[PDB]
Request: fold
Amino acid sequence: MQEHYQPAAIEPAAQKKWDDARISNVSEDASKPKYYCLSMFPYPSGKLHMGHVRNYTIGDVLSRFKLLNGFNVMQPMGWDAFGMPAENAAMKNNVAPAAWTYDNIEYMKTQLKSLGFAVDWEREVATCKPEYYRWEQWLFTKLFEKGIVYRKNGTVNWDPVDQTVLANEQVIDGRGWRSGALIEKREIPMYYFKITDYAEELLNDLDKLEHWPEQVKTMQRNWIGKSRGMTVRFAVSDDSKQGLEGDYAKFLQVYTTRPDTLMGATYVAVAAEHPLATAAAADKPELQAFIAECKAGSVAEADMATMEKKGVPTGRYVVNPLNGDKLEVWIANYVLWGYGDGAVMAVPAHDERDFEFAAKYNLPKKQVIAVGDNAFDANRWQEWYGDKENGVLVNSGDLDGLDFQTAFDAVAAKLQSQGAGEPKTQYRLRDWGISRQRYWGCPIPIVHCEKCGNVPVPADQLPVVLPENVVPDGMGSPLAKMPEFYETSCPCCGGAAKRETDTMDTFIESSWYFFRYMSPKFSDGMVSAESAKYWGAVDQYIGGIEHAIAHLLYARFFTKLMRDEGLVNVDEPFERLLTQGMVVCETYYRENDKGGKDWINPADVELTGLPVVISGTEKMSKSKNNGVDPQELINAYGADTARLFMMFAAPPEQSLEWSDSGVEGAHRFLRRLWRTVYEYLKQGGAVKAFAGNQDGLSKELKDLRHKLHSTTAKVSDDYGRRQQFNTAIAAVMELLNQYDKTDTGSEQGRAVAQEVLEAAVRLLWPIVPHICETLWSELNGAKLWEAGWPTVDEAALVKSEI
Ligand SMILES: [Mg+2]
Ligand SMILES: [Zn+2]
Reply:
């Protein structure tokens, strides 16, 4: 055993030892209890970043802990290979996105192997391979026939200069992000998952997830946005029917979640496309300009809750069916055509968005709810104005005194008996659009034929292979300009036809990869029946916060989809969720030639020859060039120091502040662990660890065993229930300090020192397995993973009798 700790010598050997023993190459073995630990698979962007290293070290700590406790642990790895960065890199460097993607994969794989993650590489998948995406094309065809996938027109944002479709995040002030050209809204046919058919299932099955964080469950309920409300019809007044046809000449229909405030409505509002807006704007050019300013804006929910809510009066009037009040119709920029009826009622006294709208335009505010002895101020909002659990009605005629629920049914009965309304349930959830006007993605298995229409490709002819000999050029998606791809025969009649050139949303590949890992070489289906039944569902999921709500919701959706097709038998994919905090770092800038700044990577900076300004700390990003390359951390201190610093500097949910001093401290603790064992072996070699009855031990050795087994208990709880690995490292450190302070020179003293060290190297093996595997083999000849997790000796926790 070498005196000094040298990670470059031991980490390659420990990895070859785990690979030769195939400790993490697991199969469907019904003898050991299964455990599926899943970390979110990475996009192959070129090389790992610090967020990758933290995510996969967390997942490896949890996997190695469960392995040491006797579980059949599956920790698979794979590559989320589709998406825009390969397409952008293809244009910047004139290479094929596939070649760019496969090069990044082979390099990033060696980086992951160099970190010693106990990963079943026999289950590796790359989603850009036909071996993978043929199965999401398969499910597509199956759901297309059943109607769960359907084709319908939808409005996108067309950049006429870049000749490409833009995401709303890429539209700034009505113009394209990279061109500045005014976007044009275009109606094109696109494909959708009828996810609204599963809204109730997606909401109620959250009750099964006893171990999910409540806020994550709350965020899924707000996205779905279920409400039980009331459809209400306001009859159009006799003086307001000009230009109106059909029912729009008869009544104005609205949806409301507060029909117990119907007596308090003071005006109504309609979308800019509502026929009442069309008819009223006919002879009024101010309303025409307002309708156009609405129709040329962004409808994104982010760009709607932040926007100035504005409106214009129309001069048309409708009648409140419950009290005969004559209410004016306004056009409003927050009412959206396509969300329900395209019209709403406004109760400024009990809706904060209506309160602010009415305060702006001096519209009336009619209190119809009372809460205790609270005074009502019509010029200042209070949160009790919106109170529903304690609301008693006032100024409501024969409804005064009722609470929310009995006023709801009273109003329902009143409206229904006169035909002017009925209860209704709605969801904010929209159908999932999966058409992408992009090349580097999974082709949509639709063939367009004039005789037969939109026809799905037969299962025999799957996959529809995306050609990889393509370099995109940024003037439209390449597939649409490639006849050798889209020219084909119709599968129903054999005549000339045209393939779908759009590709799928990449959220699709991430919605089911956790099932493909169970049998990634299976060629008869998405997932083999045997392997899906054994592995069941993901026991632990570790990932990031970016796009998490949509990713989770989509993966739950696909699970129920695949279950109903007979592929899986579980209802929910993820039993536990751990979202890691970001990794932050300081920023450094130097002013520009004309009132600006410029940021430089921290590695290329002289800390403590020109002076550079130390700015502020933020997430490691290319925006201010503060991303510390993890490869330079590995080369400098070894993989164990990299893993130790990430697990020690912060709890996994908390943000982790990069510290050069922190990394040095981590590496210095590893040398201490190494030197602690070495000095122990050079003073007599190894012995049999202490075990059994502990009476007759000295007061000092008894206390060391108490600290030992109390530390084992703390580390177990930190790994198993708290998932707080930083305090677990702190615990082992405290045990080592008590060790150093203890005379372990006697025969029984060495037996206790052996037990202290044999436990310490096993308590830290999930965090730093290279040095722990190496130190363990110098103390003990048995296999570490068969010695298992250190057990708690409760007899050593029973203090003396005084
Ligand atoms: Mg349960
Ligand atoms: Zn045909």
